[PDB]
Design a binder for this molecule. Sequence first.
Ligand SMILES: Cc1cc2nc3c(=O)[nH]c(=O)nc-3n(C[C@H](O)[C@H](O)[C@H](O)COP(=O)(O)OP(=O)(O)OC[C@H]3O[C@@H](n4cnc5c(N)ncnc54)[C@H](O)[C@@H]3O)c2cc1C
Ligand SMILES: Cc1cc2nc3c(=O)[nH]c(=O)nc-3n(C[C@H](O)[C@H](O)[C@H](O)COP(=O)(O)OP(=O)(O)OC[C@H]3O[C@@H](n4cnc5c(N)ncnc54)[C@H](O)[C@@H]3O)c2cc1C
Ligand SMILES: [Ca+2]
Lengths: 473, 473
Amino acid sequence: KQFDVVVIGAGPGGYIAAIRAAQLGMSVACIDAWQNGQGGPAPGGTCTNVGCIPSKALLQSSEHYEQANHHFAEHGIEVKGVSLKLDTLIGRKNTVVKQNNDGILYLFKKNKVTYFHGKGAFAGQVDGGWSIKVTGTTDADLVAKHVIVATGSSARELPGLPFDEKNILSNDGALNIGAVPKKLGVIGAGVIGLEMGSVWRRLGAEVTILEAMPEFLAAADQQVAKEALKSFAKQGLDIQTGVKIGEIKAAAKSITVPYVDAKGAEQKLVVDKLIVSIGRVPYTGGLNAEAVGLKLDERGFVAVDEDCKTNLPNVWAVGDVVRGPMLAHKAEEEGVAVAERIAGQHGHVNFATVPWVIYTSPEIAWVGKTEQQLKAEGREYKAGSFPFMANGRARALGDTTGFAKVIADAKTDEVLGVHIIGPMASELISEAVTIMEFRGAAEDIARICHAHPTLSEAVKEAALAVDKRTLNF
Amino acid sequence: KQFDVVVIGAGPGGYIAAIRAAQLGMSVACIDAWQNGQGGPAPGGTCTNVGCIPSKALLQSSEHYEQANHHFAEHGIEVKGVSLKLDTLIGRKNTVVKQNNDGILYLFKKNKVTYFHGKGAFAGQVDGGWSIKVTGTTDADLVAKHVIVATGSSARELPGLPFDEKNILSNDGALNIGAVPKKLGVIGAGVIGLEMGSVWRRLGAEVTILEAMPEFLAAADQQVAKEALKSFAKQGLDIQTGVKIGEIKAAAKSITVPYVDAKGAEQKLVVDKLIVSIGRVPYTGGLNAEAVGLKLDERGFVAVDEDCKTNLPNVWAVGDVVRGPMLAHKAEEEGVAVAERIAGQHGHVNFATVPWVIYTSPEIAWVGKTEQQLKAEGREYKAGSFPFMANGRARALGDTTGFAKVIADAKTDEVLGVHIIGPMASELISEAVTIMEFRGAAEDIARICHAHPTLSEAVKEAALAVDKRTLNF
Ligand SMILES: Cc1cc2nc3c(=O)[nH]c(=O)nc-3n(C[C@H](O)[C@H](O)[C@H](O)COP(=O)(O)OP(=O)(O)OC[C@H]3O[C@@H](n4cnc5c(N)ncnc54)[C@H](O)[C@@H]3O)c2cc1C
Ligand SMILES: Cc1cc2nc3c(=O)[nH]c(=O)nc-3n(C[C@H](O)[C@H](O)[C@H](O)COP(=O)(O)OP(=O)(O)OC[C@H]3O[C@@H](n4cnc5c(N)ncnc54)[C@H](O)[C@@H]3O)c2cc1C
Ligand SMILES: [Ca+2]
């Protein structure tokens, strides 16, 4: 059948692109191959099925378990015992994932987006535009004037160590371990590795995280990374950076990771389960790109210009499969912008104001540039910081770890970056993204009324600190 | 000794005004009479000692107690034999109050504010400005060019029923009950009554809240008020509005509250303790306003103009003792503005962007105008809302109660109000205040990238709803 737009993929980029295009009056088809455990439709891509949603769910349940075991007596809460029912914990997450799968199907129905459960591939050009063939769980021959490629990503594998999701786990297996492992190994100390390592440590595993890169969380503000590393060590996450990993061997019983530590001493990490979190790679498997001449760069990303247009007429690409931050909200921003451009509008995507969030305890969130980056560009700046120990709400909450930091241009006072480590950082950062979108100044934050007592007041005080006039520190 | 500024009161308005005046290079004295348990200094006024700080502390601890008893099973956390050590819970709050008292003393030292622990009063006008006499815990005779009256408030009492903080409790007694009462009565269903009722209900009390006003939370958005009443009823708070309260009598460890319900039937509420939370009244006890002819209104508020100036030259008044929202951040806004005006600057205080927050579960937070106010002034608007049930972070969290609402001008799209009921609403509202301070539009909120998954996304979606184009609902 004929459509104005065919969207290949139903992850954050594709499902939103489809909905936005439908709002703009277009007949839209969205093709997605993801399957649930019983082989049925499971929209939402990586984020819903093996990504943001399930990882955030396990982080919350594991945080409650940590609270029950170590932080309730100080509140006058006495217990006779605490035990884990892992099937129920994993079960709640599975239910949330399913709710999200169903919810997206419902959204497609409401918006009259035609959903095809299967794999979509380019067949060629025809009179009506592009011929897209659907195979696998559904067979269909579609035609569309515009095609939006939103095929996403796959977990990067360590060379010679394929994932089996039983003992050698990607993000997929990490979210489905059937029993808390005695000893868990994690390769990669980036956002995903820290989150996954935190989950399982809280549930009872001894966790060791090995990172080949010498610098820990290099993209985070220096002050943030240092404080985070300190908190993670206290929590019991044995993080080792600057290591050289050898040939990993997965035997029936033990997985042995031989490595040379940072000091140059030989080591062997012996674990019951291993999670490998060393990045994401763009996915175009089965898209039949090469056949129609759709250009990919050397890393496998679909090549696009500033407006997400590929080399083929009326073929666009968004999300993890193209350049830029590999984040759900980035994919969604591009999906919306491409639908609007197809409709004849301008669209808006600005990577400079995309926020980054780590959902560990403490939470970490930032938007804009770090001090390191500003120094690298020779951009004169002033930074102000305020600790949660001095915040009334953090004190009342019983969680005073961390700080808020605002960095401004030394001459114009324009806010160039905001960095937060502490309670609810993921939510507090919204205010900073807003300020940056208006190209606001540190003094603007400092002069905006913040409700008392709230964690948000730390952002105001950090801004006051830029001008050496914090009121509560 | 001679000071440029003498501030009478060390609550949010006064301690902040004093600090700000000192930052601006003026010589400042701050006089405050509050005493801790041992009769020593205890800065921070109502908010620190018997207000915001301890109330938020008990709310969090009692919420943890509630979580342990009812919301941990679903996360796979089996906690057996949960019990309460009330003395430890109250003790944690007492330690936090002391941290805040000590913190303000340190801020005064750091900023070179001369602190006088005692009662400050006008003596008369002199050539150097105003003669201020300190008595009680300190004896001193000061001369100030400018005086800032920040004497705060006290608890409103029912005629014939004085507080004793044993059986008939104000906010003071409510934060120090020695044992969980089997049956707790609360007169007043406003912010404090709902918060205090929630604390003690979670800890084991059967709570009944009686309110004379026929409308529940009349100042809030009606949809927010309606959902709130539904949530509180479900939680076990028996809230009755439009009742006529008779003569309350306490005797033999019991308290009888005769009343006529909204349907004209006599009733009798028999409880073990009674909290009366029916408002706050301005306090100027011992200020000696008559000696200098300082004008007070018929309720006892210090009369002031739009810039917080009284009828006496160089005498200003801020916070709860003057007109406007009786809130901590409002007092701070005025203290800062007055110090800035004394220094020769313009100052800025805008009640239209002052946020209101209720720290119940769910939390309630709003800023700006409600639909009912806009209808009344005949200003055409557009409202949009989004439920947390459709938000990925709320789902992951396991708390999907409520929604976010954005109200915009129908012609200019300028945001006129934002109303939120749900998880972390107190923190999410900061984004709305910031938008209003920049005179931003609903479309601005909608275009701003919000991190996924975060509760803040609900604010973005509510803004999309204003233009009838929500994506995830
Ligand atoms: C463990 C983990 C945690 C994460 N947490 C967060 C977080 O907290 N916040 C955040 O912003 N981001 C997070 N991410 C990143 C986020 O998941 C991605 O950035 C986002 O999913 C990218 O969306 P997308 O639509 O571009 O691609 P994807 O989500 O990968 O969706 C691609 C979809 O297309 C389908 N597909 C591919 N090829 C075809 C074809 N030929 N035909 C039909 N269908 C096809 C796939 O089956 C898939 O459903 C996380 C990732 C992981 C792995
Ligand atoms: C239970 C409760 C919970 C609350 N929760 C919140 C909340 O969550 N958020 C919020 O914004 N607001 C809250 N409030 C309101 C908040 O406490 C007040 O709005 C705020 O304290 C007002 O500050 P202020 O400086 O004007 O007065 P106050 O805090 O009352 O301080 C006045 C100070 O002056 C002293 N004083 C008075 N006269 C003299 C004199 N002659 N000489 C010397 N000292 C004197 C008093 O002892 C006191 O220390 C709450 C109030 C209560 C009762
Ligand atoms: Ca109302």
